[PDB]
Structures are given as structure tokens and as C-alpha cells.
């Protein structure tokens, strides 16, 4: 359902949506599909078919995505008229935006039933893999699936986030939005109404949202970083009862899938944020050009 859909324009000519509870739902079974095959070395040979099934699923889900493409291209088209209002009083094509934006969310909820069929196929596949899990005695279950899988598929993702300063990344994006406001203040003052002073206001505000979506996803990134790093130490280098092992691997597939969601989206949002920052620079220069001319 809506309120949980993210818009992404990493490129100038690119726009894609993402249903956050779907990417997390799919990522969750992506983990316990792997955790349930690396548990005992007798079963690693299944990765080829597991990778193969995730590909089949990611294709069926994106066939459903490509149905709304027609409405997508309308909005990509609407934006470009606002981006560079070259060849065009303003709220005329500006309102055409909000309605085509909302016609596409309406389009997704149309196939919301079609997305669930692809989702449960990931759960049904994930389940029949994790249920077949067995130990030699059920009293001493080995944390070898958990150990390998984290070190390989997850550890890298954690390491990268530790290296960067996701708080200076935010603190820098803010300085960009604040100086744009100060200069757009000086420009709307110096000349008054002009269609491009309204495109600067549009993008500036549009970028203010992408920042708030970034500020929020890095907060989940910060929390799931300490938790996954803390929790992991208690689920490896030991043996559990089988009913406790299955429990601990689900708690993991949860921390993972929620961390992976907020990391994957934060990158595309940073991508979109700085993609809109470029457009905002072109306009800014064109205005400075227009202004000095009058003098």
C-alpha cells in the first residue's frame, strides 16, 4: 500500500518506484533461503538453483512493473516540462504533475494482487528450503550456515557503511539545500516572477523531500548496523537446540532484510538527490544569465 513507495531518479532520464514492504519481504526469504542451504556442507550445491529461482522471481515481479510503464512515461514527460520549462500559467503544467503522480500510485495498487502472487512464491520457496533443515542429533545444531552466510553475503555490506560517514553525507546535503534557499531568495527578490524562478522552487522543494527520505533511511541504517553487529556474536561459534536455531536464523533474516532495504534505497536516494542537484545547477546558471542581461 501507498505511503511506503519510493520514487527514484538516479539519472536524468530514469524513474522507478519501489514498494518497500515488497523489497524487504523478498529479501527476508532471500536470506532464509540461503541460511537453510549453507547449514551443512552436504547442501551447498543448491546455490545454483536458488540463485536461479530468485532470478525467475525478480523477472515475474518486473513484468508486473512494466505494465504501469505507460503511465510512468507520462510522468517522466511531465517532469521534463517542469525541469526545463523551455517552450511554454505555471501551476497549469505543475498540477498535471500531482495527478499523473497519483495516477501511477493508483496504477500500482491495481496490480497489488499481482505482486503478492510473486511474493508468496518467494515465501513458499523459502519455506520448503528452511523446513527441510536437519542436524545430526537436534540437541547440538551447528551455526555453520549462519556463520558462512553472514561473513560472505552480509559482512561486506556492513564494512562499506562503516567506512563512510553517513552523517557527514547528510550534513553535506543540508548545506546544499540551505545555500540554494539563500540564493533563490536573492534571485526572486532581484527580478521577481519568472517561470524559471518557479522551476527552482519546484526542484528545491522536491530535493527537500529526497533529503528527508535519506535522513530517515540512514537512521535505520545506523540502528541495524549496531544490532546486526551485536546480535551476530550470539548466533555463531556455538550450537543450539534445533527449535532455538530455527528461531535465531529467522531473527537474523529479519535484521538483514530490513537493513538491506534501508541501505539499497538510501544509495538510490542519494543518487536521485544528486541527479536533481545537477538539473538545479543548470537552471541556476541560466537565471544568472537572464538577470545580468537586464542590469
Amino acid at each position, epitope marked *: 500500500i501507498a505511503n511506503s513507495i519510493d520514487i527514484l531518479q538516479e539519472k536524468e532520464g530514469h524513474l522507478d518506484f519501489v514498494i518497500i514492504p515488497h523489497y524487504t519481504f523478498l529479501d527476508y526469504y532471500k536470506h532464509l533461503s540461503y541460511n537453510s542451504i549453507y547449514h551443512k556442507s552436504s547442501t551447498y550445491g543448491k546455490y545454483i538453483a536458488v540463485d536461479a529461482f530468485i532470478k525467475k522471481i525478480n523477472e515475474a515481479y518486473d513484468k508486473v512493473k512494466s505494465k504501469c510503464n505507460d503511465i510512468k512515461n507520462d510522468l517522466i514527460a511531465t517532469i521534463k516540462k517542469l525541469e526545463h520549462p523551455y517552450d511554454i500559467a505555471f501551476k497549469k503544467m505543475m498540477d498535471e504533475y500531482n495527478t499523473k503522480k497519483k495516477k501511477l500510485i493508483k496504477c500500482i495498487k491495481n496490480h497489488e494482487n499481482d505482486f503478492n502472487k510473486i511474493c508468496m512464491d518467494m515465501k513458499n520457496y523459502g519455506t520448503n528450503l528452511f523446513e527441510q533443515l536437519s542436524c545430526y542429533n537436534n540437541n547440538f545444531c551447528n551455526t555453520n550456515g549462519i556463520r558462512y552466510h553472514y561473513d560472505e553475503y552480509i559482512h561486506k555490506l556492513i564494512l562499506s557503511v562503516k567506512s563512510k560517514n553517513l552523517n557527514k553525507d547528510l550534513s553535506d546535503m543540508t548545506n546544499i539545500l540551505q545555500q540554494s534557499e539563500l540564493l533563490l531568495t536573492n534571485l526572486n527578490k532581484k527580478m521577481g516572477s519568472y517561470i524559471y524562478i518557479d522551476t527552482i522552487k519546484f526542484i528545491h522543494k522536491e530535493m527537500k523531500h529526497i533529503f528527508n527520505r535519506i535522513e530517515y533511511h540512514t537512521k535505520i541504517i545506523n540502528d541495524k548496523t549496531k*544490532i546486526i553487529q*551485536d546480535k551476530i556474536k*550470539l548466533n555463531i561459534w*556455538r550450537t543450539f*537446540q534445533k*527449535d*532455538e536455531l530455527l528461531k535465531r536464523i529467522l*531473527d537474523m533474516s529479519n535484521e538483514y532484510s530490513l537493513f538491506i532495504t534501508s541501505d539499497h534505497l538510501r544509495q538510490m536516494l542519494y543518487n536521485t538527490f544528486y541527479s536533481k542537484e545537477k538539473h538545479l545547477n543548470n537552471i541556476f546558471h541560466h537565471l544568472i544569465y537572464v538577470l545580468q542581461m537586464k542590469f
Partner: single-chain antibody
Amino acid sequence: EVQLVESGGGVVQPGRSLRLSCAASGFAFSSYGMHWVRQAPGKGLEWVALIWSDGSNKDYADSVKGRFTISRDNSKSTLSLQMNSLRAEDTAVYYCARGKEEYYGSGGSDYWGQGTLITVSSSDIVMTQSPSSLSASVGDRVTITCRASQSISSYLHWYQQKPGKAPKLLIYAASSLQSGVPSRFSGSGSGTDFTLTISSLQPADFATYYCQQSYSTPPTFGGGTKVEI
């Protein structure tokens, strides 16, 4: 400072219901798993139920299954136990204790509440504590033994239940001294056999003493070791 004040206890006609609650103060409640452990009259420590820090997972003792229900409200910092279908076996002092380890409440119990009394008006690992009763004089090196029915690797913790007061943790990993516990107390062991060593018994009469495994699902306790001076 920490505090787990419990409430909700009293006399109950057999077969009815009663709700028990716990008031958490002094720590990040949201990060800790909680446990309810009872002590029937004169008998030892029987674990009732546990819940994870996020309240997602929660497990019970075999006897109370289908009757009791644990829950927590992280905002108010509240833990509760809804006891239904009360049998005469549920007569006990009910302790609300905090798990040592975050999220899972594994590896023992940091702090304990005083406990609230319930009076009804009518597989799992087995710990075998060696000396049931023991009478020494001041200064004696004292030793108690705990035998586990299954190899539990260093997941052994020792507790000190003074006369009519909430248990207190002394050793967490098989040999790990809790800060504030004097030098004297020491533990050792692995797999199946573990032992606690009170060198130089000090005058604080140490009352009864219980061990606890935390490797498998129901964290089993041994019977006690009453220590007289």
C-alpha cells in the same frame, strides 16, 4: 539504578485467572529480554516464561503452556504474565528477572525483583546439584557441584538466594565473576560438570544456592545448596 517491582498477586480460587505485572526502571528496557521464574513453597526455582526485547519471540515452561501468556509494553516499561486456568501447582513466589544479554535475554539474569506471592486454594535438561545441605564454620573453603544431563558448554550461572529475598547473580560464563561479587566466589567447569568454590566463607550467611543452564530452551535450575554458618 535498576528496579523490577512486581505486582498482582494474592489468593485465588482454583481454576480462575490472575494477572501479574512488572514495573521496570533504571535501564534501557526496550533492549532486554525478560523472564518470569517462580518458586513453589519450599521447592527450588522453576522458570516459567521468557520474551524477547522486541516482544517478537516468547517461550514457556511445559507445564504452563496453553494457560499462561507473557507480554510486554515497551513504552510504559511493563512486563506481564496472564495466568489462566490456575492449578494448585502454581502456588509460588513469582520473580520478574532481566536477561543478562540484550534482545534474547540469554546468558543468565542480571537483576531480579522481590517477587509476588500467589496462593491457589485447593526433553528438557536436568541439573543435578551435588550437596543438598551443608553446614560449615566461618573461614572454610566450601564447594558445590552441578551436573548437567547434557553437554552445555560453559553456559552455567550460579545464584545466591538469601533468606526470603530475590536471587542474586554471582557467576555468568562458567567462571565469570559479576562486578560487585567479592573475590572469594569462583566457578569452573565445561560440558557436564561444573563447580562453585567459596574460599574463606565470610559471615554474610550465604543461605541457599542454585545453578542454571542456559544452553537449551527451558533454562533449567538445579535444586539448592543451603549453606549454614
